[PDB]
């Protein structure tokens, strides 16, 4: 028998002690080797109540990724409310690696396997595991990248959908390549997406969203206000910071039939996603900077009000990167033996 509980977890990885890539350096000294013989356990004829919006695994992954980025990235200058330190800012190697989250002694993780689970309801076929799967800690905005795909249907996740201050996550059946590239002025880059693929996927997402909002019509709009990391799709490709204008992806007129290319830019000064302050980087490296990623999640915020109108609008971007972890951690739940 088990009860719900919260305890300190630890992490597991396949990191190399000799690598200079920054995630491997963090993961050899913060994590242990992956379970050499893992095996899951069915919990026959048992039901449990998962709730992906109050999971402490998420807070712990947040603190972990913060520590990793705090030691890992080397800006020339870091400014944090009056204080500003200046340090050597060498280039770094950077490519996220999958991380598992293991329970300590006297606890175990439960796994919701209901193919179309929405993160909050009860669960049919519950499993017991030692660790999570390999979760890649990739901070990004608007788009969720290099994650996992929904088993059967596209799934729409929120705390309530009738609250507009609470983020909504959409999990796709089918990943869509975003092929970002800076070719061999030095900051202008561009992200490319197969327009036919992406627009079919977006029509399917519209159909689901109409399913949950009373058949009502829905439309997409660019983000309304705030700093660049919200208004545009921001991410990190090999130490450089990409900012891409995503408006051509949320193109209602074309629910385009070829290649969409987003104007991306590499930025020298950024605001740290840890809420901390702003940091200055060194000019980008030379050569072809490539980044082929899977789009396997979107985050939306619904325009408040307009309960009068016969349509609902949705803009990309949802709060702070903690929820990205939810995107993968939704199906787990640590309990006390």
């Amino acid at each position: 028998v088990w009860k719900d509980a919260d305890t300190t977890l630890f992490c597991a990885s396949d990191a190399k002690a000799h690598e200079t890539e920054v995630h491997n350096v963090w993961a050899t000294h913060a994590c242990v080797p992956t379970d050499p013989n893992p095996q899951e356990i069915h919990l026959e004829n048992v039901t449990e109540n998962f709730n992906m919006w109050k999971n402490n695994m998420v807070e712990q992954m947040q603190e972990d990724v913060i520590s990793l980025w705090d030691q890992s990235l080397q800006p020339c200058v870091k400014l944090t409310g009056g204080s500003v330190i200046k340090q050597a800012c060498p280039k770094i190697s950077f490519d996220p690696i999958p991380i598992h989250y293991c329970t300590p002694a006297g606890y175990v993780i439960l796994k919701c396997n209901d193919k179309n689970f929405n993160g909050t309801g009860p669960c049919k076929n519950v499993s017991s595991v030692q660790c999570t799967h390999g979760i890649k800690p990739v901070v990004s905005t608007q788009l969720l990248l290099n994650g996992s795909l929904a088993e059967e249907e596209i799934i729409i996740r929120s705390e309530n959908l009738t609250n507009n201050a609470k983020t909504i996550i959409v999990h796709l059946n089918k990943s869509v390549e975003i092929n970002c590239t800076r070719p061999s002025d030095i900051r202008k880059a561009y992200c490319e997406i197969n327009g036919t693929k992406w627009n079919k996927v977006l029509k399917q997402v519209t159909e689901k969203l109409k399913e949950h909002f009373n058949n009502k019509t829905i439309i997409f709009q660019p983000p309304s206000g705030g700093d660049l990391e919200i208004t545009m799709h921001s991410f990190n490709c090999r130490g450089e910071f990409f900012y891409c204008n995503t408006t051509q992806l949320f193109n209602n007129t074309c629910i385009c039939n070829g290649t969409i290319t987003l104007p991306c830019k590499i930025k020298q000064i950024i605001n740290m996603w840890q809420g901390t302050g702003q940091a200055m980087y060194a000019p980008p490296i030379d050569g072809k900077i490539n980044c082929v990623s899977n789009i396997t999640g979107i985050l939306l915020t619904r325009d408040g009000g307009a309960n009068n109108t016969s349509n609902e609008t949705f803009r990309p971007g949802g709060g702070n990167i903690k929820d990205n972890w939810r995107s993968e951690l939704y199906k787990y739940k640590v309990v006390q033996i």
Partner: antibody
Amino acid sequence: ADLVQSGAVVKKPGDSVRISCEAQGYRFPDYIIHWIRRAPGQGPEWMGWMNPMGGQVNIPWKFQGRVSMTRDTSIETAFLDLRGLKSDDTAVYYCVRDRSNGSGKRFESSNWFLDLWGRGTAVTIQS
Amino acid sequence: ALTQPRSVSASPGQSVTISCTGTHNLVSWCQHQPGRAPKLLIYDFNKRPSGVPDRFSGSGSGGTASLTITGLQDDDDAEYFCWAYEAFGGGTKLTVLG
């Protein structure tokens, strides 16, 4: 712990107004901030919420373009901006702190949790 | 957006009930003394925070929500407002009849 609002003012039609909200006694970066409106002879009217971490805003159609909710985490102050004032904009505006939403340990409220309230700033449109 | 009557009144010791009609979402309540900063009283129908007395309470189901203040005092004379997300009540002036 309170939200200090700026003093009352008068304006002319058209025109535009800026109002502050200096947060005190808590972590301004966490918990979003709603701006609400009370006009003479009408019930309270919400104008939008603003996440002070990144500055993201959620604003209903009635006020698109005409309003902007900004902030300056350096001195923990929110800001409301209204352009092109008419008569129906004459009102008292409050900044208010939600605490069931944002980053940080939220309060646990399924509805909106309007914890902390400013004292109000009156703008009068003297046409 | 949400109805709410305009006036309540009672005398230093009895009990009153303000209500908010509208639609079936959860409602929180707020007291607003003349010109002061409003104060959260009770949230999510019946739940009550801390710093606020047991006399204030509430509930709700069927379309309308109720907020009750028992054992009134000469400092409860203020306006009261309710909300369900961004649907707002018009307000209710509470008069303590002297």
